[PDB]
A paper describes a structure:
In 2008, a novel bacterial β subunit homolog, termed Anbu (ancestral β subunit) was identified. The individual subunits are essentially all in the same conformation, assuming the same fold as the proteasomal β subunit. Via an extended C-terminal α-helical segment, Anbu forms a dimeric antiparallel coiled-coil interaction across this subunit interface, yielding a 3-fold increased interface area for this dimer compared with the respective subunits in the proteasome.
Crystallization trials yielded a monoclinic crystal form with large cell dimensions that led us to expect about three to four dozens of subunits per asymmetric unit. Unexpectedly, these 34 subunits in the asymmetric unit constitute the repeating unit of a continuous helix spanning the crystal. This is contrasted by a high degree of variability in the lateral interface between the dimers, enabling the formation of the irregular helix with its two unequal turns that differ in the number of subunits and in the rise per turn: A superposition of all possible pairs of neighboring subunits yields RMSD values of up to 1.6 Å. However, the Pa-Anbu S1 pockets superimpose exceptionally well with those in the proteasome, revealing a relatively narrow, amphiphilic S1 pocket, in which F30 and L52 form a hydrophobic patch, whereas the moderately hydrophilic T20, T48, and S55 are oriented for hydrogen bonding to various positions in P1.
Residue numbers in the entry:
A (entry chain G), B (entry chain H), C (entry chain I), D (entry chain J), E (entry chain K), F (entry chain L), ...: 1 to 241
The structure:
């Protein structure tokens, strides 16, 4: 479980893995990036991390309620209020499943909610386990969920609000490369989605499998590159021994 | 707090940061790499991570006991037994400080113990919070303590049992570069030590400050390198949008 | 005790064994697949694993309550809510039988709940011992209960959301074949049920006995096949000795 | 962690994975198959599963003690007594590391010990977590450690005391194939060793990596085979719906 | 103490011995089969096994409470709920007699509860020492309490859901014959009751004494039969010596 | 696990199953009947039941010690002393494997030891979990180990000191028939041995597999016989309803 | 200490000795049969055996509490509940006197509680040292406390539910005769009470002393009778020598 | 288990039952009266009670040692010394079987040793569980083992040193009658032996089975007699109600 989202000058980029702890000796693939919207009016993306049961219930309720007269991700007036609604829904799920039977088992999960509603700029929020949230800004234009330390440095180094979408996406992919190599809890397939500021369309998004030609290639290249740079770095002076 | 140690064909390489959480609003510099030994007979290095009070007490008792007739890091017959002694000492410290007054505060810490005693190969162990330990091997030739996910990938990618010492050290430094950029809890100065297999001398080791010419240079180079490789990676195919 | 359920493009497939630990020196046959519904409106299937007393009580209450004005598997508005109801009922049963008299004996059990209610797609959930549940998806389209590691690989290898029902069923049967050979706790007769997406009928389902001509045949074939493939695999090179 | 050993008419075959849980967020490669002996006099193989710290300590002490006047794997008069010595050593390690500091953490591990000493037949034992052990026989000629249910069926189906070594090894590899696909805690490289009855030599053994041409090939073949056989199985009769 | 109960297509059959361990050097006769009901409305039978004191208290309270406005075996809406009530009552009794004074003495007992209440089919449950219970089904149509292994085989071999009552009873009697011969803790008189599906009458039931003409006769016949069959079985081939 | 041994006027008969609990989810085949002796001088048979590890170790030590100058099953002056030696050996094995590591796991096992040594009559003993033993006599001429209640009645009914060997063996086989049908922990193959009083030869003994023509036949006959006798028994009189 | 009670068709009969171990070298007379009740409403009898201090304290508290608003032997709704109250009281007494000071001394005692309360049949219970109790029934119509084996046979032989009260009493007296002759811990005076079913009066009861004309007479007669019968029995045949 | 022995003016009489607790759910027949001697020189009888394993071992060793140059029941100079030897042998057996493996299980047993050695009068001893013994005398001419309270009164009443043998034997038989009726742990067949003072022959002794004409007859008579005497006893006076 590792998710990244970026809010940049030209729009939004989202990327999630799929490897999921679904119980003991049951590790499995589950989509962690979900889209919602009405074409020409709004796009909203939700990413998930943490307890599967909880996050599934949250997503499921959001879907059921879309087709119902009352508060829903389709009628909510701002990305902020969408984020609040997701949190609100999370609280509701935690209230029901909590009891003596759950015991000490850890039901918490976290989310990212981003997108654009007609008449206001695109936005991106992250909701924490405890249900309070923060918003990405130009100074801090990307947010992560899950097992994210491994792939943070490459984003810190290169990403900024002005990074174009194609490059941000590339950058995200390198993030996943390192993460996947160093931590088995994170794993393919990946799910990506790029959204263009003011387009107000629902992009189809794209899934990166084990076989993906492009992703295989940039991984091979990135390895060769790092190995090269390392050998061509200078030796430490006398002093260091 | 981030420490790395490597046990390679040609010897051992150790590196630690110094930034330490010593209470609220009191972040400070403390050495996390300590050496012990008698020239021509043995070298032992201990690195620390976790609770400052605990680790300090452990190190302090190991030093006091060196100058005393009984079990000590200078008479212990093997690196294994040295590791065991450190652990033994840790248990002793935890027993004394534990009480109602400590309450729920977290007194645990972890260590690495590596080196060489005359008449057997060099070795490297890591002691866990709970006092049990593991040994580095050719298949898993480096071990980390502290805040280590950020700088793990570069080691996973490039380091192997056969990597020479000068290159392993270099590799470690890049590990610290990324870590420092992405996590404030980790910070300079760094303390390094390189030990040559069968030398049985106590290297002086070296401290890398903010001002270090060499470290500044390889950071600047590494940045330029990464930035280059990133721009010269190919674009995603049509399919990805 | 081994149960499998699959949620595929064309519908649902369920399969359970019947061998049951009913106490010490009392191993016995009990159905572990139960159906509910009203023709033209809904089909729901519940499978059971774990403590017999507990699961029986749960099923029994669900049956009694069907014929009663209030929450029941026949009036519940979605497969989700059905799953929730089963869980709710489980909690109720655990509460009552728990006491000093039970002592340390393990009263937990698990369930699968799947089916289709008029006006929404078919769905499949698995409820864990602790009462929280997950939903099968296209990326993870089958779920297991009980003693399931033995027969997992064949499903992992061949089954996907798009697998047709007849082939999924066949696949399940091979899963049971391996399981039965390698673990005595699992045993015949088996109980199967196939449901076609949007049919909204209650299939009669089918019981596979010791004598079943078809199942005997595919077991014999599958053996011969495996034995053949193994002999016709190449020899390991020189290197391997 | 998955290990298999077979004691057959023509000798012994051993195979182990290397993926090891070494702490939280620290999964790593460690050899789990170790050899000992004097050429023309004896071969002994020890495989490990369970807690890394414990098993490492046991192996380490056995190695140190080989080079010492007293009970050791090189002077022990029978494979039985070797097994007993390993167990004896395990007890010793558990006694020392046990204390308040370990707490509720699970230090147990299991071993296989097999081989041949001059003047008696080859033998194979498995030591349980609790320190008691069993011997493989003609009726039960293979033994497993670790995560073994996934790959048990293929061994149950095909393996017997009279299976030749080359075919037993092949069989083991298919066992690992299924296991690796269905459980991420098991992983390459693998380590194999084949020993010929009465040879009294120390085979070098062989390591199967990710890249291995032969293993890659039989995996590809085995997949194609299974897929074929599945499509060419008959359809269930009318009765089954 | 040995009890059997069967739930068959045509109704229920119950049979119990009477020999009871009432303390040290005090073995005695106590009825272990009790009936309750209102003619034309319900029949319930309770059988007992285990601690005399505990089971007596349970039965005694059930009787007292029948003549009292509140939950009782006469008003309870289903055989299920009757079983639950018995269990509920058992818990109550165990709570009271438990203390330091009882010490380690074993107060547990088990029950069978079967019968029919107007408007639903007949049913049969068995309650375990720990208070949870199971229901007999067509696949497992008989249940035993007490010292039951001796007489199990004849029931396993011959009894099924479709066995008529007169034959099931006969079968039960042969079960008791073997048991009584092979285990002194079981002993006559026996108590039988046969109930016809949908009759809703309280059969008087019947006691089999030492002197019973019919039971004496079938025992004599059964012996002669077994002895005959044994002598007329063929001799083992050469091979067997 | 079910073993029987008989000491009759004409000699000894031994029979054991092979199904063995070797751990959780690991049920397997292991021989439970072992022979020892020198032709023309002695025959001794040992049967085992209970913990596999313990019984294997006992048997293994007895074998090793046979080929060694000191107390052994070949030099022991009487069947009594043989039994004592087996017990003695058992104590030795329990002493070693006992420790904190075993914990509460149950290491006990039981044995039968029977045979004949030149110059004295044949004899048969049974050793209990606690190491004390009894001897079979004319009044109690058979002894059982393991899961024996199921097949006791047929032996109680028919077997006496004067039963000839061929008929005793036949009787034993029927005992196994019933046991196997009613308890899964008991299972084929079976191992038999018949020894003729004063022959002083080592019979080869015989193994009964699943496929055995004779055993299959008498099982089929015995079923038919029982079914016949049951239908031809009279009906219970009026009185019984 | 020897007490008997019988529950017969026509009522109840109680009889107790009086010899009591009250400490070392202090054997003494204490009544062991106590009556309670309100004429025309209820009769309850309590007999005691075991530790004097304990039983006295129990009786004493029951008496004090009779004259107090709350649970007492006079308001309790059934003989069952009376028995439960006695047991309850016993627990209370054992709780208080238990401590380090008592040490290993044995404070346990047993009771019989029998009688009749208006509106339900007469009943008789026996409470065990541990506080659980049993009820006498038609099949087991008498119960004993204390040193009872000596006088059990005459009761087993002649007493049944239908035995009239005058004959039962006579039978009890012979029981005491044998007991007194064969065991010095039992001794006169005796205390009797006979109660007629449905009389609901408090009989005065009667004390049998050393001097009692009737008891002396039947003892003398019984001796003469036994001596006669013995001489007029036939001689053993030739065979017996 | 119930044994009696008498030492009278005219000789000795011994009688034992045979019912034996041989383990849980294994009650069986074993001889508890054993004879030894050389005609014209000595007769010794040993009776056993208590733990089967222990008493069997004792008897077995006494038999083996008879045929050996050293202390044995045939060379021992007095009945006293014979008794001492038995005790001595018991100690030896307890020493060997005692260990951690026996645990808390109760290995004790008791014996009677009686008979006559040329040149001194006949004698009779009883050995207690703790190995010290007593001798029967004219004032206390009979001794019992096992479950003996039931049949003590008839012996106390009628037996004296001067009772002739035929009458003492008869008396013993009545003792067994009552015991058997009132306690199931005691049971037939019985074993008797009568020895005539100064005869110095080994009587064959006699076994009383279920079918014995004489014993059946005196039981029937004794019942009728007791029943008669009881009905012919006078009624209690007015006073007693």
């Amino acid at each position: 479980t590792y998710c990244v989202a970026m809010h940049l000058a030209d729009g939004l980029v989202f990327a999630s893995d799929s490897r999921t702890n679904a119980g003991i000796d049951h590790i499995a693939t589950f989509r962690k990036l979900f889209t919602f919207g009405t074409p020409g009016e709004r796009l909203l993306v939700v990413q998930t991390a943490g307890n599967l049961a909880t996050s599934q219930s949250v997503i499921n309720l959001l879907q059921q309620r879309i087709r119902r007269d009352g508060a829903s991700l389709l009628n909510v007036p701002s990305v902020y209020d969408a984020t609040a609604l997701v949190a609100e829904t999370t609280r509701e799920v935690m209230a029901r499943d909590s009891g003596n039977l759950a015991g000490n088992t850890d039901l918490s999960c976290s989310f990212m909610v981003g997108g654009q509603i007609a008449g206001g700029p695109p936005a991106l929020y992250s909701i924490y386990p405890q249900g309070n949230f923060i918003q990405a800004t130009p100074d801090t234009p990307f947010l992560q969920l899950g097992e994210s330390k491994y792939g943070k440095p490459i984003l810190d180094r290169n990403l900024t609000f002005d990074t174009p979408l194609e490059q941000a996406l590339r950058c995200a992919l390198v993030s996943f490369d390192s993460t996947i190599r160093s931590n088995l809890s994170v794993g393919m397939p990946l799910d990506l989605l790029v959204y263009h500021r003011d387009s107000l369309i629902l992009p189809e998004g794209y899934r990166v499998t084990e076989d993906d030609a492009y992703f295989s290639a940039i991984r091979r290249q990135w390895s060769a590159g790092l190995h090269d740079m390392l050998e061509r770095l200078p030796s430490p002076p006398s002093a260091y021994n």
